Amino acid sequence: SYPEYTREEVGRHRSPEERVWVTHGTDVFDVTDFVELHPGGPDKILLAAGGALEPFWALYAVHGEPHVLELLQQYKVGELSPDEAPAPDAQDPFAGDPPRHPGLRVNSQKPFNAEPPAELLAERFLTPNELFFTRNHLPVPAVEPSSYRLRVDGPGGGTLSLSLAELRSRFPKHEVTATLQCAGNRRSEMSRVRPVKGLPWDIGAISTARWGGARLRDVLLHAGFPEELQGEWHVCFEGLDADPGGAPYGASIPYGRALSPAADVLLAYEMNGTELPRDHGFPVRVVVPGVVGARSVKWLRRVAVSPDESPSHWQQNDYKGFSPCVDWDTVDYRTAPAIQELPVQSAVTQPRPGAAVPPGELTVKGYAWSGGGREVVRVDVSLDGGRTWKVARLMGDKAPPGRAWAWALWELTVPVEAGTELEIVCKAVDSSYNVQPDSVAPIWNLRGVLSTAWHRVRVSVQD
Amino acid sequence: SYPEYTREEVGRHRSPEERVWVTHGTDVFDVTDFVELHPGGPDKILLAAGGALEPFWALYAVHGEPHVLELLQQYKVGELSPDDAQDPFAGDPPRHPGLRVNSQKPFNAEPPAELLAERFLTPNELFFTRNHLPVPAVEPSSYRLRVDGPGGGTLSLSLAELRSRFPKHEVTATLQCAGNRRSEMSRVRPVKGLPWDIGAISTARWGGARLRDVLLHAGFPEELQGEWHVCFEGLDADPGGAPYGASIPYGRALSPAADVLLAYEMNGTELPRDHGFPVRVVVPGVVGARSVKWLRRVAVSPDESPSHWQQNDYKGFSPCVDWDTVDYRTAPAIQELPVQSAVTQPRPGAAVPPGELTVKGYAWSGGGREVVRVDVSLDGGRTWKVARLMGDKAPPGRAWAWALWELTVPVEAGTELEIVCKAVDSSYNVQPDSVAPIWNLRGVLSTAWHRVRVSVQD
Ligand code: HEM
Ligand code: HEM
Ligand SMILES: Nc1nc2c(c(=O)[nH]1)N[C@H]1C(S)=C(S)[C@@H](COP(=O)(O)O)O[C@H]1N2
Ligand SMILES: Nc1nc2c(c(=O)[nH]1)N[C@H]1C(S)=C(S)[C@@H](COP(=O)(O)O)O[C@H]1N2
Ligand SMILES: [Mo]
Ligand SMILES: [Mo]
Numbered sequence: 001s002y003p004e005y006t007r008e009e010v011g012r013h014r015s016p017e018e019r020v021w022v023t024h025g026t027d028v029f030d031v032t033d034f035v036e037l038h039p040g041g042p043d044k045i046l047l048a049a050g051g052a053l054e055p056f057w058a059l060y061a062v063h064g065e066p067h068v069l070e071l072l073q074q075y076k077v078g079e080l081s082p083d084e085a086p087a088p089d090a091q092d093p094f095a096g097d098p099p100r101h102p103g104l105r106v107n108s109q110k111p112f113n114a115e116p117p118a119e120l121l122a123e124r125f126l127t128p129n130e131l132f133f134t135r136n137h138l139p140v141p142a143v144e145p146s147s148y149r150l151r152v153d154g155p156g157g158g159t160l161s162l163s164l165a166e167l168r169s170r171f172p173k174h175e176v177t178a179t180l181q182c183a184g185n186r187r188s189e190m191s192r193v194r195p196v197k198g199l200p201w202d203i204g205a206i207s208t209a210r211w212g213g214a215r216l217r218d219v220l221l222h223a224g225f226p227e228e229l230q231g232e233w234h235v236c237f238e239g240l241d242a243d244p245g246g247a248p249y250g251a252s253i254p255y256g257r258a259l260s261p262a263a264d265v266l267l268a269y270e271m272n273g274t275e276l277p278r279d280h281g282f283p284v285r286v287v288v289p290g291v292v293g294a295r296s297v298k299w300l301r302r303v304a305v306s307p308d309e310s311p312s313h314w315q316q317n318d319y320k321g322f323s324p325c326v327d328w329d330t331v332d333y334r335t336a337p338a339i340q341e342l343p344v345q346s347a348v349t350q351p352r353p354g355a356a357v358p359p360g361e362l363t364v365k366g367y368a369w370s371g372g373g374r375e376v377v378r379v380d381v382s383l384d385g386g387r388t389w390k391v392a393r394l395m396g397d398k399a400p401p402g403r404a405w406a407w408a409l410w411e412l413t414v415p416v417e418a419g420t421e422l423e424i425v426c427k428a429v430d431s432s433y434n435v436q437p438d439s440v441a442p443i444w445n446l447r448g449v450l451s452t453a454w455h456r457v458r459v460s461v462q463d
Numbered sequence: 464s465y466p467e468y469t470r471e472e473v474g475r476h477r478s479p480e481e482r483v484w485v486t487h488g489t490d491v492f493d494v495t496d497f498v499e500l501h502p503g504g505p506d507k508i509l510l511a512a513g514g515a516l517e518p519f520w521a522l523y524a525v526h527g528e529p530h531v532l533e534l535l536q537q538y539k540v541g542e543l544s545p546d547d548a549q550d551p552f553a554g555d556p557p558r559h560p561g562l563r564v565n566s567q568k569p570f571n572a573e574p575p576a577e578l579l580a581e582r583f584l585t586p587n588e589l590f591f592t593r594n595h596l597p598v599p600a601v602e603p604s605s606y607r608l609r610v611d612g613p614g615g616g617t618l619s620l621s622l623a624e625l626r627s628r629f630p631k632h633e634v635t636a637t638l639q640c641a642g643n644r645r646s647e648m649s650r651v652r653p654v655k656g657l658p659w660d661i662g663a664i665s666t667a668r669w670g671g672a673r674l675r676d677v678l679l680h681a682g683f684p685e686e687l688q689g690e691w692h693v694c695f696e697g698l699d700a701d702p703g704g705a706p707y708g709a710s711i712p713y714g715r716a717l718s719p720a721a722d723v724l725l726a727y728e729m730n731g732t733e734l735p736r737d738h739g740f741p742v743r744v745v746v747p748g749v750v751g752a753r754s755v756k757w758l759r760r761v762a763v764s765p766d767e768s769p770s771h772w773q774q775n776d777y778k779g780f781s782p783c784v785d786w787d788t789v790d791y792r793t794a795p796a797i798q799e800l801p802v803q804s805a806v807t808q809p810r811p812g813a814a815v816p817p818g819e820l821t822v823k824g825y826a827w828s829g830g831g832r833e834v835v836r837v838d839v840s841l842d843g844g845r846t847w848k849v850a851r852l853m854g855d856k857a858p859p860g861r862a863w864a865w866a867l868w869e870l871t872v873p874v875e876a877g878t879e880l881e882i883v884c885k886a887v888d889s890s891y892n893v894q895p896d897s898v899a900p901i902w903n904l905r906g907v908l909s910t911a912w913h914r915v916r917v918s919v920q921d
Contacts (some may be wrong), residue, residue: 017901232859256859321887323836323838323847323849324838327850336880342890343893371890380782380783389782389900390781390782391781391793401712427900429779431795432798432800432801432829432830432892433797434801434802434890434892434909435801435901437893437894437896438897439896442844442885
């Protein structure tokens with residue numbers, strides 16, 4: 001008595017005129033008429049249009065209670081049917097890419113690059129897997145579990161070939177909660193100064209998850225490498241994704257970080273308690289805590305030890321910072337170091353730019369984070385464009401010294417006067433007392449990476 | 464043949480009327496008349512007035528040549544003679560008169576800014592000095608270093624034992640006071656603290672025992688569960704008996720890479736009295752406050768040092784905090800310092816000649832993070848050029864020493880410049896544009912861009 005629909009067909013209903021449909025479990029709901037009845041307005045609920053409620057239920061667990069579910073059942077109109085998963089490259093190179101939640105803010109479809117709606121970013125310490133930002137340079141690899149092999153070699157160690165099963169049984173499983181931030185986060189603020197090359201990220205190219213897997217340290221020691229090597233040695237990684245020419249995505253990290261127990265570098269097979277999603281590297285990815293997202297290679301195929309940095313294009317000719325004076329005709333990637341640890345950062349996630357907020361009390365919220373395991377010791381929040389500041393409340397548990405891999409969510413509730421204008425700014429300070437710079441121009445660079453000047457959000461107060 | 468004078472006497476002769484006297488070796492020279500004949504002008508030579516030429520000779524080795532030593536010998540006027548609670552500072556060591564002194568009792572001073580980046584290693588005589596108390600008079604033979612803590616064998620090391628039981632390690636490290644550049648903070652709103660300019664920072668090659676080796680020798684383990692600390696106590700104390708003290712996390716004390724030393728040598732000689740004789744702690748990449756001088760005790764503890772200066776000083780606060788709301792429990796003790804840089808050449812208000820101008824300075828970052836770039840502006844931060852970084856590369860994570868930089872640029876007659884510098888470290892940390900947003904009641908952690916205005920001779 002209930003018509004069946006595919007995830008794809010449900011994704012066609014994302015608007016009132018079209019009808020707003022959402023899914024939960026294997027049920028399909030038409031909540032067009034409910035949007036106006038939703039507590040807190042339609043702004044958040046409409047973020048789920050055409051897709052699953054799952055991730056949003058994880059952010060706001062009150063929806064899991066019986067009374068909310070009983071309300072939701074009033075809007076049921078169908079059921080989902082298993083999605084067939086078909087014959088690569090006939091249609092196109094990205095034809096086998098996994099489906100994604102429609103609530104993501106996509107800035108590139110082929111290759112797929114997207115960030116979750118900024119208002120949801122600092123609503124939960126662990127970012128739901130369906131909303132975790134995604135950055136793909138190439139088509140997503142389609143991997144058959146049983147035949148996948150991770151190759152590990154290099155000078156001083158034999159040559160291993162580990163199946164997913166062996167990775168899971170041979171090495172003790174460790175979990176590390178770590179925030180991944182792309183080098184291009186907040187690149188859109190760089191473009192306001194002068195046009196740059198790169199994906200036009202807003203403040204959401206950063207997400208946090210509890211990663212589970214083998215320690216890189218343990219796998220390399222098993223391969224026979226020593227705990228320490230004299231001089232500057234590197235651990236190079238190569239993914240299963242490659243361009244038409246055959247060069248795979250690759251990156252490396254210093255050998256010292258790879259072998260250090262406290263550095264928590266993992267060969268992760270689990271993400272937020274479940275198997276790694278395809279977009280995030282199924283079956284295995286490197287996770288390098290405190291280091292720019294580019295080095296956390298997904299769809300891992302090879303691990304090697306070398307006296308030199310990875311020769312990959314992305315290690316050598318991308319992801320570097322330059323003086324603001326450098327232009328395409330003078331840029332020389334030999335003159336700057338590959339980005340490994342990232343500088344202190346923060347952004348306001350609530351309210352959003354252009355909002356008109358009710359007078360009285362306003363709760364300002366956001367995230368703050370610093371690379372290299374350096375914790376956030378304070379976040380300063382201004383309502384007047386950075387003239388005067390108040391200290392925000394830092395949420396969450398502290399971590400051991402030098403191992404603050406996860407962001408600090410913060411919030412501050414402040415009184416706001418009817419009919420005024422606000423310019424809301426946040427800036428964070430880390431455990432080495434490094435701070436964020438006032439403006440973007442002086443840190444501008446042609447690729448628009450390393451965008452950490454204060455985040456400024458303009459809103460008005462209603463009357 | 465020659466009258467003999469003490470250093471104190473020679474320090475009274477620093478001008479034409481009193482006569483300008485300087486020393487070299489054990490000789491005293493009256494160079495009053497030679498000041499006008501000194502190549503380059505009187506400015507430089509007069510910096511040494513009343514004191515030793517040694518430190519300056521080290522900055523400019525051209526002075527080591529035969530003709531310079533010979534040119535000086537004709538001005539000899541004499542020879543140097545060696546050597547209660549009403550004045551607790553009566554026992555302090557003599558200092559070079561060329562230092563820029565901000566406090567005499569207790570003694571706190573910095574070298575002239577123009578000399579700071581003139582040599583990678585700062586001569587011992589010019590190395591900035593920060594004393595909270597009177598300097599301890601220590602007899603070498605009877606000096607003992609106490610080491611103790613839970614799970615370790617109590618040690619009582621003499622200087623000789625500190626030199627022989629532990630393999631000597633040498634670490635070149637820059638010490639920077641938390642108040643360096645405080646004067647830029649004062650400009651915005653008055654703060655509490657010594658009025659340092661840009662010279663509360665200096666660099667030396669330190670030599671001593673690794674703290675790690677001493678602790679291991681006592682039986683302490685490489686790692687302790689939870690957050691443990693290593694506390695230091697100096698021999699200097701207030702009138703009530705509380706000694707200067709500080710601490711560093713246990714993890715840093717035991718790390719082989721952290722290079723923390725129990726130093727007994729500074730730039731090749733024994734530690735000067737003002738810099739901790741006979742032994743000081745040197746904590747590379749960490750604020751000067753933690754490098755306890757005149758070390759008397761090393762203790763392992765589950766808690767941070769209870770000292771006043773570890774608990775109720777040397778911390779950073781929001782710019783909104785004032786004396787009526789400051790609460791030292793709300794911030795962490797300063798350990799690693801943030802990226803920093805300053806222009807040492809030209810000096811503020813100078814009138815430089817048209818043509819080419821060489822701008823020079825220093826740059827450094829804490830935590831062993833090397834300086835990867837220094838941007839220099841001549842138009843107040845609108846446009847920037849990249850400076851040349853001098854110095855030798857250090858191993859990743861172990862860049863404890865500053866990077867001296869320079870940039871030569873063409874300057875037009877009759878112009879006005881606003882020279883600005885900013886540095887970037889290897890975790891790509893950067894310095895903030897302005898001082899107001901990082902202001903704090905103690906004026907510490909002053910790392911906004913350094914701005915120097917000068918004019919070009921028309
Ligand atoms: C058709 C699906 C949905 C239904 C039936 C629903 C229903 C409800 C109900 C009954 C409450 C009040 C709970 C209580 O405290 O008793 C609530 C609150 C809330 N819901 Fe939903 N919701 C839906 C979808 C969503 C989605 C997708 C989001 C976020 C993307 C969301 C965000 C919120 C928030 C933020 C509140 C908090 C209260 C406030 O707005 O001030 N809801 N919702
Ligand atoms: C009585 C003590 C001194 C004597 C006899 C002396 C003598 C000289 C002589 C002979 C030269 C030229 C060497 C050559 O042939 O290249 C010279 C150069 C120089 N001296 Fe001294 N000097 C004295 C003190 C100082 C001091 C204390 C300073 C530093 C603060 C200083 C800074 C310099 C500099 C910077 C130059 C190079 C000039 C330039 O850049 O054009 N001198 N001095
Ligand atoms: N194999 C492979 N790994 C990769 C990439 C890639 O394109 N291929 N993108 C990198 C970059 S630049 C980032 S920011 C992170 C993003 O991870 P995520 O998609 O799971 O958020 O993956 C890194 N790992
Ligand atoms: N025992 C003792 N150690 C000390 C101090 C002190 O007053 N007593 N001053 C500290 C501070 S605040 C600094 S900045 C450095 C300065 O070292 P220096 O004088 O050798 O330059 O010493 C540190 N070590
Ligand atoms: Mo990235
Ligand atoms: Mo200091």
